[PDB]
Design an enzyme around this catalytic site. Structure first.
Site, short mmCIF file in Angstrom:
data_model
loop_
_atom_site.label_atom_id
_atom_site.label_comp_id
_atom_site.label_asym_id
_atom_site.label_seq_id
_atom_site.Cartn_x
_atom_site.Cartn_y
_atom_site.Cartn_z
N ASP A 207 17.16 8.97 -51.18
CA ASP A 207 18.19 10.06 -51.20
C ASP A 207 19.19 9.54 -50.08
O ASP A 207 19.08 10.05 -48.79
CB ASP A 207 17.52 11.22 -50.75
CG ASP A 207 18.21 12.47 -50.67
OD1 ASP A 207 19.53 12.30 -51.26
OD2 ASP A 207 17.78 13.53 -50.19
N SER B 151 37.60 10.29 -53.49
CA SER B 151 38.03 9.78 -54.59
C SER B 151 39.48 9.93 -54.57
O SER B 151 40.10 11.00 -54.35
CB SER B 151 37.14 10.28 -55.75
OG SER B 151 38.00 9.77 -56.92
#
Length: 330
Positions: free
Chosen positions: A35, A199
């Site tokens: 994770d 992004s």
């Protein structure tokens, strides 16, 4: 040193991925959920409340000659999906894919929430976010990666998750045969303890690319792709009959649909998520309403590039002095 381990989806939907991890001496192999959005390595154990164990493999520290109780240390964690676990702490030898760390904090669960109990395939979590998020008290502990870093050939790990197929986590090297083209690196902020990056935009299907900054985290422990409501609405508007259902808890779409791809930007590069990756199947057995793999982050407070996005790429988690993230197509 290096390590290399295969990671395998837990079910037919790729809801999560498990990776075998050797703990203790002699080795006890547990299948852990790696994770990159948390920083605790915790396991089902001989200390876990009996009624909360249902098919998991447990770590028994009394059977490990290298286990030592970390006196006074406790831990307690709550995850974004509302699940939680807590307990005490041992140090022991932990190996992943041939890479060994001695003195790793292994957090032994005394209690786990129902969703953990109900998932017999996940024996615990191995956190790979920054150690500043580790919950051990009163002395915070380091992640497996943080402990291994100095010994690694290069201070990196990579995630190569498969679509309905196994993939690979590598530590200490970049497998140049595992991706196509070049790796595009992008800046990371560690201010919130995550692999947080921005992004450069998105496209839906064959549509034009929208240049827009989307701050979010690379999180292998989250199944879906959670993005701003504007972006998510633009995606689902291209699927006839798709709608947001408050009763179901997100966007659903007719199971008869053919889903468009979704592209996200990494600098000037582009990662394309095929439409099929966005299908999470019937909302309940036999239903013709299917659950979407792209969902709104509104009210999460953060955008999350979870498995849906990451499995479309070869992803480099570069833990150099100034961390960065790299993405390649594959």
């Amino acid at each position: 040193s290096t390590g290399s381990a295969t990671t395998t989806p837990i079910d037919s939907l790729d809801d999560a991925y498990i990776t075998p991890v050797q703990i203790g001496t002699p080795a006890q192999t547990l299948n852990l959920d790696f994770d990159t959005g948390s920083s605790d390595l915790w396991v089902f154990s001989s200390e876990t409340t009996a009624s909360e164990v249902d098919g998991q493999t447990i770590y028994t520290p009394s059977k490990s000659t290298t286990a030592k109780l970390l006196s006074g240390a406790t831990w307690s964690i709550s995850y974004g999906d509302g699940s939680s676990s807590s307990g005490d702490v041992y140090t022991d030898t932990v190996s992943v894919g041939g890479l060994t760390v001695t003195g790793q904090a292994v957090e032994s669960a005394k209690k786990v929430s129902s969703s953990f109990t109900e998932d017999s395939t996940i024996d615990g979590l191995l956190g790979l976010a920054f150690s500043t998020l580790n919950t051990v008290s009163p002395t915070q502990q380091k992640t497996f990666f943080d402990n291994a870093k100095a010994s690694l050939d290069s201070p990196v790990f990579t995630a190569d998750l498969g679509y309905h197929a196994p993939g690979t986590y590598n530590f200490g090297f970049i497998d140049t045969t595992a991706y196509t083209g070049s790796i595009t690196y992008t800046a990371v902020s560690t201010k919130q303890g995550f692999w947080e990056w921005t992004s450069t935009g998105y496209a839906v299907g064959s549509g034009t690319f929208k240049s827009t900054s989307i701050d979010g985290i690379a999180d292998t422990g989250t199944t879906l792709l959670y993005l701003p409501a504007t972006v998510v609405s633009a995606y689902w508007a291209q699927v006839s009959g798709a709608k947001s259902s408050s009763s179901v808890g997100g966007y659903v779409f007719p199971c008869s649909a053919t889903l468009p791809s979704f592209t996200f930007g990494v600098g000037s590069a582009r990662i394309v998520i095929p439409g099929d990756y966005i299908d999470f199947g019937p909302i309940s057995t036999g239903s013709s309403s299917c659950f979407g793999g792209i969902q709104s982050s509104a009210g999460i407070g953060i955008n999350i590039f979870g498995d849906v996005a990451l499995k479309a790429a070869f992803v480099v988690f570069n833990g150099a002095t100034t961390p960065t993230l790299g993405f390649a197509s594959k």
